[PDB]
From a paper:
The 3D structures of wild-type [name] (or the point mutant [name]_M228V) in complex with nucleotides have been determined in five distinct crystalline environments using either single-wavelength anomalous diffraction (SAD) or molecular replacement methods. The polypeptide chains of the HAMP domain were fully traced into SAD-phased experimental electron density maps of the [name] orthorhombic and trigonal crystal forms. The domains are formed by two parallel helices (α1 and N-terminal part of α2) linked by a long connector, which despite a low sequence identity adopt a dimeric four-helix bundle similar to the Af1503 and VicK HAMP structures. Despite the overall asymmetry of the [name] homodimer, the HAMP four-helix bundle is perfectly symmetric as was also observed in the Af1503, Aer2, and VicK structures. A strict 2-fold axis passing along the length of the coiled-coil relates the two HAMP subunits, which adopts a packing mode closer to a canonical knobs-into-holes model than the unusual complementary x-da observed in the wild-type Af1503 structures. However, a negative slope in the Crick angle deviation plot suggests a departure from an ideal knobs-into-holes packing mode due to a weak heptad repeat periodicity at α1. Overall, the observed [name]–HAMP conformation resembles that observed in several Af1503 HAMP mutants associated with a kinase-active state. The 3D structure of [name] is highly asymmetric, not only by a different orientation of the CA domains, but also as a consequence of two potential bending points in the central helix α2. When considering together all [name] crystal structures, it transpires that the DHp helical bending promotes a strikingly different dynamic behavior of the two CA domains in the homodimer, primarily due to distinct interactions with the central four-helix bundle. In all homodimers, the fixed CA domain is sequestered by the DHp domain in an inactive kinase conformation, with the ATP-γP positioned far away from the phosphorylatable His248.
Here we report crystal structures of the full cytoplasmic region of [name], a prototypical HK involved in [name] response to envelope stress. The sensor kinase [name] senses a variety of envelope stresses, including misfolded proteins, and transduces this signal to the RR CpxR through conserved phosphotransfer reactions. The full cytoplasmic region of [name] [name] ([name]), encompassing the HAMP signaling domain (residues 188–237) and the DHp and CA domains of the catalytic core (residues 238–457), has been produced as recombinant protein for structural studies. The [name] structure consists of a homodimer, in which the HAMP and DHp domains from both subunits assemble into an elongated central coiled-coil region flanked on either side by the two CA domains.
Residue numbers in the entry:
A (entry chain D): 188 to 455
B (entry chain C): 188 to 404, 418 to 456
Write the structure that this text describes.
């Protein structure tokens, strides 16, 4: 009973759930000093991590504002002057920086703050829109999207825009790297929802698969492509799902490409 | 006792000691899975904190490159076209972002140098060198440095280069903005070390004192604040009795 409590609390903290376990302050006899020192440890760790994460959020917010004024200026150029070759350079770079700042803001919105404004939502209600937009996007690319099993009215608790973006990034990423087909499969049990996204694109090496959720990920074969953001997408996915008490895995797809697995616990 | 082992291990990690794997895997069969999962937690936390630091150390590098291509585009427009009003606007914002990125680059060079394994260090051993270099720098500026009370062999846990640079930045800043004198005073109790840096320079308004640790206003005191806060301490900016700015750093003591 007390060893089980401390093991589950250490395994929880190890996944990114830096929250107080009052359960360790009810421990019979002597595991109260160990449990109370453990919760003191959690508080100290949370205070230590939020400092660097805050610096990140502050830089993100300070960078955001002049870039918007810059984006306004370029829009006013396109007004006085026409379609120039230089504008095609400036607006391109402006958008690249824009996406980067926005993604930095998001990664400072997720893991950093406990200030998460959460609500109770149902899986189908949450991701149906994302799946429909992904289906349209697939149709436009001349690619096929098959939802092996759709999400049902399964209870979840957390930030809806965060989870919406978490699945949106996974499926859009699968849309990008795929050759012709993409597959999305939902699955539920007593404990939680498991979303599996497969693509028939080029496989990812077992070394790269382990470090794909890295903030700025040096991808071999996709650096040569240069057809995306900066690699913040998947790190956003990971931080967003981990703060939602879930997990993310990257495996080799039976379609031949990359398999992405998301797991989220059910609300009770 | 196994509860005492786990309590001392949790109290160690709480002080920033991830850089140690205690032997919680040698005793009763039940406390072995808890001990092994605890050490796995320590490794995961260490892996989580070095990744957060890597992110800040990479932002500068990632943002720099497209901004330079943007600055190239605008430069080519001043070449093919004249000096438009909109180009003046875009270039103003481009220079604002430019300076910010350059300062972030400076922050990732200082993080790349000071980036190490947090370890157990003694206050005097840590900052004596910084205080001596600051004394020489004061002498060269025709200014005076008085260490009211020196640091003693007081136990601390953390990155030595980080704390070295934190005090170095505070004292160098106080040397810059002072008129003639700077005072550094150390103080210890059972809980922690309190460093106070004063200068006879121009005072800082109570509004500005609250937003002095803001990132952009060549790293800034924001690094000082975040580095001391990650070292479980705190930083305060008050009005100095010398007439200038008083900077207070507090750091907790390490206990085995
Ligand atoms: N001792 C001081 N006396 C007066 N002004 C100070 C002092 N310390 C800091 N400041 C003010 O605080 C501002 C922010 O500090 P800082 O981040 O170190 O800026 P900087 O990049 O110029 O070194 C400085 O621009 C300066 O005007």
């Amino acid at each position: 009973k007390p060893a089980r409590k401390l093991k589950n609390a250490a395994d929880e903290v190890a996944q990114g759930n830096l929250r107080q376990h009052p359960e360790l302050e009810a421990g019979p006899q002597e595991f109260l000093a160990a449990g109370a020192s453990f919760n003191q440890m959690v508080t100290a760790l949370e205070r230590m991590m939020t400092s660097q994460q805050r610096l990140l959020s502050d830089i993100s917010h300070e960078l955001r504002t002049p870039l918007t004024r810059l984006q306004l200026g370029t829009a006013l150029l396109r007004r006085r002057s026409g379609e120039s070759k230089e504008l095609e350079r400036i607006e391109t770079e402006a958008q690249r920086l824009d996406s980067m700042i926005n993604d930095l803001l998001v990664m400072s919105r997720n893991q950093q703050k406990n200030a998460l404004v959460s609500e109770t939502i149902k899986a189908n209600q949450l991701w149906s829109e994302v799946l429909d937009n992904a289906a349209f996007e697939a149709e436009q690319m001349g690619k096929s999207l098959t939802v092996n099993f759709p999400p049902g009215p399964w209870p979840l608790y957390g930030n809806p825009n965060a989870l919406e973006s978490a699945l949106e990034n996974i499926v859009r990423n699968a849309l990008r790297y795929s050759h012709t087909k993409i597959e999305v499969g939902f699955a539920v049990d007593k404990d939680g929802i498991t979303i599996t996204v497969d693509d028939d694109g080029p496989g990812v090496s077992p070394e790269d698969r382990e470090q794909i959720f890295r903030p700025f990920y040096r991808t071999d074969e996709a650096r040569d492509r240069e057809s995306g953001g900066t690699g913040l997408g998947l790190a956003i996915v990971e931080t967003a799902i981990q703060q939602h008490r879930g997990w993310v895995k990257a495996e080799d797809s039976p379609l031949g490409g990359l398999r992405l697995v998301i797991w989220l616990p059910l609300y009770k």
